[PDB]
């Protein structure tokens, strides 16, 4: 009874952009990962610190679900120890990551015949992100020595750039929906685990 609400995460009407990813807490419920794993709709179902068939037995304190939309060719960057624009300035995973990553193609939903420009990513940032850190600042990025006072120009850029999702794009530049599950087992009594 009181099954975990996994339908409100995977089947959400709209997703978030990668620079402003969505985080959801799962607790006080029973989780059935068999339906998630046996589905044939997922292009990527990869996980590292747990055995994919043993999720139904392990019991954790709580679960985190982080969801966003990225480019098809950047799914390889959502993994421990990776480097790139997404891994360095948008979404960083720890090297001792536990949990796992699910990703599927959503070209029919996130592409528009004239081009979809509602999805953004950060391109300019002074330093790398700490694991599980979010940054939604939209201040003008200074790339030179002369400080601009909030007006865009030659060496002062808006740090967010839009994807160009379009239905005729080749596989590699088509949108992909990504959900990352993180399992926390703390000193508190375990709460999330299946039958």
């Amino acid at each position, epitope marked *: 009874t009181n099954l975990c609400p996994f339908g409100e995460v995977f089947n959400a009407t709209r997703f978030a952009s990668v620079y402003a990813w969505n985080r959801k807490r799962i607790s006080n419920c029973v989780a059935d990962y068999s339906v998630l794993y046996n589905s044939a709709s997922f292009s990527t179902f990869k996980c590292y610190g747990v055995s994919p068939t043993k999720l139904n037995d392990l019991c954790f304190t709580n679960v985190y679900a982080d969801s966003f939309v990225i480019r098809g060719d950047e799914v390889r960057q959502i993994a421990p120890g990776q480097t790139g624009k997404i891994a360095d300035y948008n979404y960083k995973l720890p090297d001792d990551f536990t949990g796992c990553v699910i990703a599927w*193609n959503s*070209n029919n939903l996130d592409s528009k*015949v*004239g081009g979809n420009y509602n999805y953004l990513y950060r391109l300019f940032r002074k330093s790398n992100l700490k694991p599980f850190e979010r940054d939604i600042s939209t201040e003008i990025y200074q790339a030179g020595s002369t400080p601009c006072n909030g007006v865009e120009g030659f060496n002062c850029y808006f740090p967010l750039q839009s994807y160009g999702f379009q*239905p*005729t794009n080749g596989v590699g530049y088509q949108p992909y929906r990504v959900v990352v599950l993180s399992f926390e087992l703390l000193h508190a009594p375990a709460t999330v685990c299946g039958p």
Partner: antibody, heavy 128, light 109 residues
Framework: QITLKESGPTLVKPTQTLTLTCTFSGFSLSTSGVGVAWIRQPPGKALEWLAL???????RSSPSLNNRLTITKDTSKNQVVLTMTNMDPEDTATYYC????????????????????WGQGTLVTVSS | EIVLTQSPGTLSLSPGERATLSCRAS???????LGWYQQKSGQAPRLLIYGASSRATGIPDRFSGSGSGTDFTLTISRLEPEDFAVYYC?????????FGQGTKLEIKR
């Protein structure tokens, strides 16, 4: 099988606004990839696309006419409303609302899209 | 914007022969963005071909389409008395979406 019907005041005085309503049956504005579009054709001239609205409230308008075009959707009663401001005597035409859909095959390959069934079309004249 | 030019402006044949219509695009876009529509006198347009080569449901096998680059063509082999109308080429490649100027198919006598 689906149907679309246009309605609204067909007589407009110059430099006021017109508001046209399209009522459709056979589909709902809640399915993925479904849209409703507005096109117009002047008497004896070629067709001109005006506006388009999607199931997720995303809308597109012609850039030259985006200044004075609004489009809204009511899913409960299946209506789409188009409003245009600052009417001119050269905007007399026939207005159609059409169903918009695309084609994918279980892997999202996109074999194109179309403006399938059109409405009967209403004649709008703008003069004093 | 993208401008589509249809050729010829008017094409007059007899019932029985083959008709060929051409649509040329100012720019270059994917061939899956072009479609062909037919409109008769005092009626509303109906979709005829989408994707530049895919027939709609209920459209007889007479109508065929093929194109690439900046040129596309529509072909009718055995045209009947009900095949004489106006034909338009339409594109979805770049906003705003534009139709062709139209081509009239006239009966010859």
């Amino acid at each position: 099988q689906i149907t679309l019907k246009e309605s609204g005041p067909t007589l407009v005085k110059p430099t006021q606004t017109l508001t046209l309503t399209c009522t459709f049956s056979g589909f709902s504005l809640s399915t993925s990839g479904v849209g409703v579009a507005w096109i117009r054709q002047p008497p004896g001239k070629a067709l001109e696309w005006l506006a388009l609205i999607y199931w997720d409230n995303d809308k597109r308008s012609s850039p030259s006419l985006n200044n004075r075009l609004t489009i809204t959707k009511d899913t409960s009663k299946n209506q789409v409303v188009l409003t245009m401001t600052n009417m001119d005597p050269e905007d007399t035409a026939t207005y159609y609302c059409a169903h918009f859909f695309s084609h994918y095959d279980s892997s999202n390959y996109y074999y194109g899209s179309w403006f399938d069934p059109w409405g009967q079309g209403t004649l709008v004249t703008v003069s004093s | 914007e993208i401008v589509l030019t249809q050729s010829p402006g008017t094409l007059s044949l007899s019932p029985g022969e083959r008709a060929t219509l051409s649509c040329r695009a100012s720019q270059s876009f994917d061939s899956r963005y072009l479609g062909w529509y037919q409109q008769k006198s005092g009626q509303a347009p109906r979709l005829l071909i989408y994707g530049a080569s895919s027939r709609a449901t209920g459209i007889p096998d007479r109508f065929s389409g093929s194109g690439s680059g900046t040129d596309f063509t529509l072909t009718i082999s055995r045209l009947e008395p009900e095949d004489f109308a106006v034909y338009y080429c339409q594109q979805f490649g770049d906003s705003p979406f534009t139709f062709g100027q139209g081509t009239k198919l006239e009966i010859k006598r």
